[PDB]
Amino acid sequence: VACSNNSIAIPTNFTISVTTEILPVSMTKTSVDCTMYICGDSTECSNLLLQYGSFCTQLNRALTGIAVEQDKNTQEVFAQVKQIYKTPPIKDFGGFNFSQILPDPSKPSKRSFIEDLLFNKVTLFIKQYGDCLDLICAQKFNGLTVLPPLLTDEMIAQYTSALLAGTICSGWTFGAGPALQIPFPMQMAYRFEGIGVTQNVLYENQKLIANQFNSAIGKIQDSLSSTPSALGKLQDVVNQNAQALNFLVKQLSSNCGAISSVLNDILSRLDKPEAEVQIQRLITCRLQSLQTYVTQMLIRAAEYRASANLAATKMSECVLGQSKRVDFCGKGYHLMSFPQSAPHGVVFLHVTYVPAQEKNFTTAPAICHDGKAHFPREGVFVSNGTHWFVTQRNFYEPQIITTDNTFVSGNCDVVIGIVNNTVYDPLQPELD
Amino acid sequence: VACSNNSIAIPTNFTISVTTEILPVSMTKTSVDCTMYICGDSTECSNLLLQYGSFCTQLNRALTGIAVEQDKNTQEVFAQVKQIYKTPPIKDFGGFNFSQILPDPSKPSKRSFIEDLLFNKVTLFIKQYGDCLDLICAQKFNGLTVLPPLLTDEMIAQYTSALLAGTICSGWTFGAGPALQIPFPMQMAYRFEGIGVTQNVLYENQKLIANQFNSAIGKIQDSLSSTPSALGKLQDVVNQNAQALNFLVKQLSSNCGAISSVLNDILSRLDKPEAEVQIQRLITCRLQSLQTYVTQMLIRAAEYRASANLAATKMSECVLGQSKRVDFCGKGYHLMSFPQSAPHGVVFLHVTYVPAQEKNFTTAPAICHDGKAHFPREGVFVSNGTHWFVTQRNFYEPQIITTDNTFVSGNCDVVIGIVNNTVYDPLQPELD
Amino acid sequence: VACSNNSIAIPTNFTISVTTEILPVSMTKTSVDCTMYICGDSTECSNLLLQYGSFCTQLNRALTGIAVEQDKNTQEVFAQVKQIYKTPPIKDFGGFNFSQILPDPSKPSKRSFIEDLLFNKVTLFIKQYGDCLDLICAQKFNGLTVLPPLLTDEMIAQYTSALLAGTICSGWTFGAGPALQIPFPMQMAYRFEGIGVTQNVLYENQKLIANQFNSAIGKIQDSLSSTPSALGKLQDVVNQNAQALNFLVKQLSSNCGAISSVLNDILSRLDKPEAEVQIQRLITCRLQSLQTYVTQMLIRAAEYRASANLAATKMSECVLGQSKRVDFCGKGYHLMSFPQSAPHGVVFLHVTYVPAQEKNFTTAPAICHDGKAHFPREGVFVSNGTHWFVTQRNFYEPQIITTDNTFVSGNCDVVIGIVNNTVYDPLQPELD
Ligand SMILES: *[C@@H]1O[C@H](CO)[C@@H](O[C@@H]2O[C@H](CO)[C@@H](O)[C@H](O)[C@H]2NC(C)=O)[C@H](O)[C@H]1NC(C)=O
Ligand SMILES: *[C@@H]1O[C@H](CO)[C@@H](O[C@@H]2O[C@H](CO)[C@@H](O)[C@H](O)[C@H]2NC(C)=O)[C@H](O)[C@H]1NC(C)=O
Ligand SMILES: *[C@@H]1O[C@H](CO)[C@@H](O[C@@H]2O[C@H](CO)[C@@H](O)[C@H](O)[C@H]2NC(C)=O)[C@H](O)[C@H]1NC(C)=O
Ligand SMILES: *[C@@H]1O[C@H](CO)[C@@H](O[C@@H]2O[C@H](CO)[C@@H](O)[C@H](O)[C@H]2NC(C)=O)[C@H](O)[C@H]1NC(C)=O
Ligand SMILES: *[C@@H]1O[C@H](CO)[C@@H](O[C@@H]2O[C@H](CO)[C@@H](O)[C@H](O)[C@H]2NC(C)=O)[C@H](O)[C@H]1NC(C)=O
Ligand SMILES: *[C@@H]1O[C@H](CO)[C@@H](O[C@@H]2O[C@H](CO)[C@@H](O)[C@H](O)[C@H]2NC(C)=O)[C@H](O)[C@H]1NC(C)=O
Ligand SMILES: *[C@@H]1O[C@H](CO)[C@@H](O[C@@H]2O[C@H](CO)[C@@H](O)[C@H](O)[C@H]2NC(C)=O)[C@H](O)[C@H]1NC(C)=O
Ligand SMILES: *[C@@H]1O[C@H](CO)[C@@H](O[C@@H]2O[C@H](CO)[C@@H](O)[C@H](O)[C@H]2NC(C)=O)[C@H](O)[C@H]1NC(C)=O
Ligand SMILES: *[C@@H]1O[C@H](CO)[C@@H](O[C@@H]2O[C@H](CO)[C@@H](O)[C@H](O)[C@H]2NC(C)=O)[C@H](O)[C@H]1NC(C)=O
Ligand SMILES: *[C@@H]1O[C@H](CO)[C@@H](O[C@@H]2O[C@H](CO)[C@@H](O)[C@H](O)[C@H]2NC(C)=O)[C@H](O)[C@H]1NC(C)=O
Ligand SMILES: *[C@@H]1O[C@H](CO)[C@@H](O[C@@H]2O[C@H](CO)[C@@H](O)[C@H](O)[C@H]2NC(C)=O)[C@H](O)[C@H]1NC(C)=O
Ligand SMILES: *[C@@H]1O[C@H](CO)[C@@H](O[C@@H]2O[C@H](CO)[C@@H](O)[C@H](O)[C@H]2NC(C)=O)[C@H](O)[C@H]1NC(C)=O
Ligand SMILES: *[C@@H]1O[C@H](CO)[C@@H](O)[C@H](O)[C@H]1NC(C)=O
Ligand SMILES: *[C@@H]1O[C@H](CO)[C@@H](O)[C@H](O)[C@H]1NC(C)=O
Ligand SMILES: *[C@@H]1O[C@H](CO)[C@@H](O)[C@H](O)[C@H]1NC(C)=O
Ligand SMILES: *[C@@H]1O[C@H](CO)[C@@H](O)[C@H](O)[C@H]1NC(C)=O
Ligand SMILES: *[C@@H]1O[C@H](CO)[C@@H](O)[C@H](O)[C@H]1NC(C)=O
Ligand SMILES: *[C@@H]1O[C@H](CO)[C@@H](O)[C@H](O)[C@H]1NC(C)=O
């Protein structure tokens, strides 16, 4: 790294970067009916399952609780707007093209282009249950059932659309109060100053910025199509849950010391006093297998709550406002964030400002005018050869050092690195 | 939602809103003495429980660890001030009435009015243990005991009182260093500018603001008295723990394949070599039931740690400072937060600023004076018909556009939406 | 606490404080090979372990998953910089001495002095495995093995060094974009204004500040050497994991109702049909003991993920930037943070600004000049006896009230506490 005693580097150009962050929000809601799972509707087992007390009750309630939380997680992340907003047929945003994030009415569920890519990338035992369709299926899947969400894909898509329409047409104001319309270019102006970059930069370079933005968005399609760009975070949710269910199914073929894995064969060709023992032994193992499954699900559920809580936080701080937290809403300086829906989760597109080309300048902590030390009101002092200028830290825009750009504090005998120069007084030429 | 290409909406009025957020901090500390729980002080079981190794040791330590954490959670949230502060007998806060949050010496535990409402709203097996009062009770409750907190309700109330006295008389300064006294109206002035609202608004509308505040507080009583306003978050802590204990008790009546659920009846009327088997079978089930209980408690404890950590964060960022994080300290723009104690948790009253009435104005990104582009130093440009003004974004207070309200950057041929107008120079009239 | 109606306290001096925060990041990666752990390579057990299905498969995968996460946790916290940076041989930082945090080439692993203290303070069954060295050891430790980290101490130290070199020579810029060199004294200047303290304070008191800093660092050695200054947070990780392993080992000596705890003795002197029963009974208990162990490890792993996530957040917000969050990066106002490596965790040295000596002044919300109310542009109005001044809140530096220090809003009949005084107009003396 460069290191200096008397010099400074300042960016002369910048780029706009759009990055993708993918967070899990929820998982497929499932339930296992302990009694039929273990006994298979056999009478002898059912009676021998009551002597064990309320284990099935606790396990059923543990799983029910998880299923309920999955809907809470979803609404906490997505349902942050009470109103449903729509964009006008007029797309006049100053050169900013949002056609890939806005809903397309010709598409299924009226998803946007990018959302359609996400849905067709994540690959979703569960399908077999969906195909047989609820008791009739439960009788075939050993008490393992799948429950529908309260919010369907369309409902979630509507929330996402409303959030986007709000963000684009009214900035962040709708997240605190009433939605206040404002031209997109002006929202950007106020987001630029919000990261220490004077608003004039946007207006003067608006065309370039719009072009960099539009290209940055197009590149998203290639990133998603080329590799599992954090898509594995959602694919793993599917895979981990699927194999957990496969475990339960496989265990129903185990003996665990029992004469067989089939209750009908235990009862057949065996006197009652022993069949009771073989059944109890099989019940014990199946119950333990079920406990193992539930314990794992309780822990995973906790992980998803934490993820959902983070996703909800991101919605509030990245999308409905402008974060000052470093690397919270992506690398670089945060400007905007645009959410997209996804299978079992939420995807955030983070728009950030990043410095590019830079130059070396000679610097100084203060300027000595006439026995008094002048400090910069905003920015730093730099020398471009034989002349000194004051400029904002994040963009090399040199300006003349004047009495309106500095303040006087203390004398020239106090500051160690103070440099002799002339501060321009803008009023004297008017008197003379 | 409204959407525009050339116009803007600006709030002309505002209201003050007070919302309530309720977080769990801790749960009743309990402990189960594995050996007596399982064996009931029987000799035969005790001896047959040693052959199983250190299961009871691990379970006892798991529960002990949870109980310890409950006190850590409490002190981390509440004990953030080393000193105990008291308010003066003189309540001169500029019209702001805090009588409902400040401690009332005539009340039990010297709680405030609102706190008394919270304590009389949350409804608290455990009571039966409290009534029998420690070994004597343990012998009757099957090894299930309840431990006292290190910090009693009075001690917690004192911490809350100290935090409130600090917040009211010294703002946030005491949270970083020494407590620096400052008039309440001045603290508010500095909290208003902190959300982008010029301090003159407070002083000019101080009476209205104090009235809106006082009414907002009164409405809290109705919200708590009318419905379980997030009070269910605390009632659920009680209910979930109570039923977990009920499960353990119920399981002590189960056979789990054993000849009976009573150790005395297993030993009676049965030869030793078989009684050993029946006892071992019963021990196995009771131990498994205990493991199930402990596992659930470990997971719930984790949830409470996370909640307590959040509550501690809120204390630091909402109460002892001014959050910039969106929707972190309630909806709207954060001004102040006043904590209140509660059964097994903490309640935060969040005071936020919310925009109200609004009007439509015509806008522009810049003004063109004489071949140079003028940008607003702070706020936006708006037209009220035939005249242009500059005003702060969050409150419609129109001012004349002058050379002291703008800065010059670039020329008039660069900015797309630039509007021709006159910028007033305040010095020329003095020369002439 | 002091409380006032018409007065204010303002700090006249300050100190620099350095505090230490210690967070766990990861734990020793271990694995238990279920099959050999339970059966001890006996044939009879191995065959009788297959009838139980996929319990060993699930347990092995549960532990494997934990081990993998431990490396993820480490890289997320430390590997936030792609480049490896080095400091120059010239230590010209304006009087700031970093010799205790920078790497010393004469030391083992090229650690810094403070890091060496941390490594020699935390005390690390596991050592016995390390001493026997992988199957050969597994055969002696009952299937309990220890895995190496992907990032060795040297690699982690290099990341820490790179982060420090960056922080010192280029501030926070390298965390957002390219590394931009800047004199250390200037970085501090921009961190002081970042907490509401005018930059002139640093330059005028640079020597004092450097001295306070250097002493604050030296005191760290005494804090670590004198007491377990949060070092218990790392020692507990070692202790908790060690005893968990000791539990597994102890359980291999239990009978759990079996004829003995030794498979060779169960098989010897016992007919096969019964040996099968005694083995199955022993397998059941050993498997349950293993399940208990794994469950505990899954929960602890979750705690470490949460801790690692916080540590990663601190790296981004405290070290690679400047936090505005209260008490997030230590008590007082945050300036800088310097990370140090440690056994199984990360240590943050937080540099904060704290107000010291203070004085009482009489205050006012506004000044009335000639029928119009003047409000302070920045800071507060105070009286030092018979004269009024305007000064910044966090440091008593009184200045004359002028037209350039205030703004006019409304008239003198609106503000309640307004005080009659004279505002100085700096231009009139030039005309006259
Ligand atoms: C700042 O960087 C941008 C690129 O991000 C430069 O814009 C490009 O300029 C070249 C000509 O040198 C054109 O061929 C490209 O088409 C432009 N790109 C875009 C998106 O318009 C810009 O000129 C640079 N500005 C400075 C001062 O260096
Ligand atoms: C916004 O971007 C989209 C996507 O590139 C543009 O739509 C393309 O327009 C070209 C030219 O007519 C067609 O050849 C492509 O097939 C269109 N792509 C798609 C997916 O429809 C759209 O024209 C751009 N709008 C604006 C105002 O720039
Ligand atoms: C340092 O800044 C000065 C002032 O901008 C530069 O001098 C100007 O150079 C331009 C040509 O690029 C001339 O048209 C101006 O008339 C010059 N102004 C003055 C006051 O001389 C100077 O060249 C810069 N130093 C370097 C090395 O570029
Ligand atoms: C900045 O200017 C001052 C004069 O205003 C310089 O101070 C003088 O330096 C000369 C030597 O060249 C001495 O003989 C004078 O007695 C000094 N006068 C005073 C009032 O100190 C100062 O050295 C200049 N600083 C720099 C960096 O050039
Ligand atoms: C801003 O809103 C407040 C109400 O929140 C208005 O104050 C009320 O004004 C009516 C008269 O129209 C009185 O009857 C109420 O008693 C007032 N309420 C309070 C709490 O004082 C205020 O006038 C509005 N101001 C503007 C400019 O619209
Ligand atoms: C602060 O608010 C309290 C609560 O309304 C006021 O106390 C009430 O005062 C009225 C008038 O004397 C009584 O009729 C009520 O019974 C009182 N309520 C209670 C709970 O005591 C109190 O006067 C207000 N103080 C100020 C300065 O406004
Ligand atoms: C736009 O602003 C101007 C200036 O404030 C308004 O004109 C003033 O109107 C008031 C009456 O409300 C008169 O007393 C002032 O003398 C007028 N000033 C000038 C310069 O004409 C104008 O009415 C506003 N436009 C609209 C539609 O209200
Ligand atoms: C702002 O004022 C400028 C003049 O200072 C206008 O520019 C002139 O426009 C007329 C047409 O009406 C041309 O004939 C002149 O040659 C232009 N002069 C220059 C220097 O460009 C400009 O059009 C005005 N803009 C608006 C929006 O009214
Ligand atoms: C502010 O406090 C510092 C100490 O933190 C004071 O500096 C000390 O001053 C005494 C003399 O009174 C010296 O003996 C010490 O050696 C100084 N300490 C250091 C580190 O230099 C400083 O004088 C105080 N300033 C004010 C205005 O009170
Ligand atoms: C930075 O601090 C270190 C630590 O105190 C200084 O090193 C000491 O220097 C003295 C004087 O030569 C020796 O007696 C000590 O034994 C040194 N300590 C160690 C650990 O080496 C170092 O000189 C200081 N550097 C600067 C520029 O102040
Ligand atoms: C209030 O402030 C005034 C102005 O600074 C103080 O008066 C000055 O006191 C110094 C001595 O310390 C004299 O040298 C100045 O000439 C005085 N200036 C004026 C205008 O009188 C005043 O002493 C301060 N009040 C108190 C109690 O210290
Ligand atoms: C601030 O000065 C104004 C005068 O500019 C004072 O107002 C006058 O007070 C006298 C009584 O002493 C009355 O007789 C005058 O009629 C008032 N004039 C006006 C325009 O109101 C005001 O009292 C002074 N305020 C303070 C705190 O001294
Ligand atoms: C650069 O280093 C020299 C010592 O070699 C020092 O005297 C000078 O003051 C430093 N420059 C600045 C701006 O500090
Ligand atoms: C600035 O100087 C350093 C060496 O001190 C060099 O490595 C770096 O490339 C220079 N940067 C520019 C833009 O010239
Ligand atoms: C409003 O839209 C028109 C196109 O219909 C455009 O020419 C004009 O510049 C827009 N107004 C502003 C302020 O951008
Ligand atoms: C502003 O104009 C929109 C239509 O463009 C309208 O719906 C809205 O109600 C108007 N707001 C006000 C305060 O007039
Ligand atoms: C101080 O208290 C009195 C009442 O005793 C009040 O009249 C005065 O306005 C208060 N001072 C300030 C600055 O508010
Ligand atoms: C300020 O006044 C209070 C009493 O109102 C007193 O306790 C405090 O010590 C005083 N502070 C100073 C610096 O004099």
Author numbering:
A (entry chain C), B (entry chain B), C (entry chain A): 705 to 828, 833 to 841, 848 to 1146
Sentences from the paper on this structure:
Coronavirus S glycoproteins fold as spring-loaded trimers transitioning from the prefusion to the postfusion state, upon receptor engagement and proteolytic activation to promote membrane fusion and viral entry. This metastability, however, constitutes a challenge for producing the S2 subunit (fusion machinery) in the prefusion state in the absence of the S1 subunit. Here, we set out to design a prefusion-stabilized SARS-CoV-2 S2 subunit vaccine enabling robust elicitation of antibodies targeting conserved fusion machinery antigenic sites to limit the impact of viral evolution on immune responses. Furthermore, we previously designed a fusion machinery (S2 subunit) antigen stabilized through the introduction of 4 out of 6 HexaPro mutations (A892P, A899P, A942P and V987P), the VFLIP inter-protomer disulfide (Y707C-T883C), an intra-protomer disulfide (F970C-G999C) and a C-terminus foldon trimerization domain.
Ruling out conformation distorting-mutations and a few additional mutations based on visual inspection, we designed a new construct which we named E-69 and harbors the N907E, D994Q, Q1011M and I1018Y in the E-31 background. To investigate its atomic-level organization, we determined a cryoEM structure of E-69 at 3 Å resolution and observed clear cryoEM density defining side chains of most amino acid mutations introduced and confirming folding as a prefusion closed S2 subunit trimer, without particle images corresponding to trimers with an open apex. The overall E-69 architecture is nearly identical to that of the S2 subunit trimer from the prefusion S ectodomain structure (PDB 6VXX41). Only one region noticeably deviated from prefusion S in terms of local structure downstream of the fusion peptide (residues 833-855). In the intact SARS-CoV-2 S trimer, this region makes contact with the S1 subunit C and D domains of a neighboring protomer, which are absent in our design, likely allowing adoption of an altered local conformation, as is the case in all our constructs. The N907E substitution places the newly introduced side chain carboxylate close to the Q913 side chain amide with which it interacts electrostatically. The D994Q side chain amide forms an intra-protomer hydrogen bond with the Q755 side chain amide and an inter-protomer electrostatic interaction with the R995 guanidinium, thereby strengthening interactions at the distal part of the apex. The Q1011M mutation is likely stabilizing through the reinforcement of local hydrophobic packing with the nearby M731 and Y1007 residues. The I1018Y mutation fills a cavity within each protomer through local interactions involving the CH, HR1, and upstream helix region.
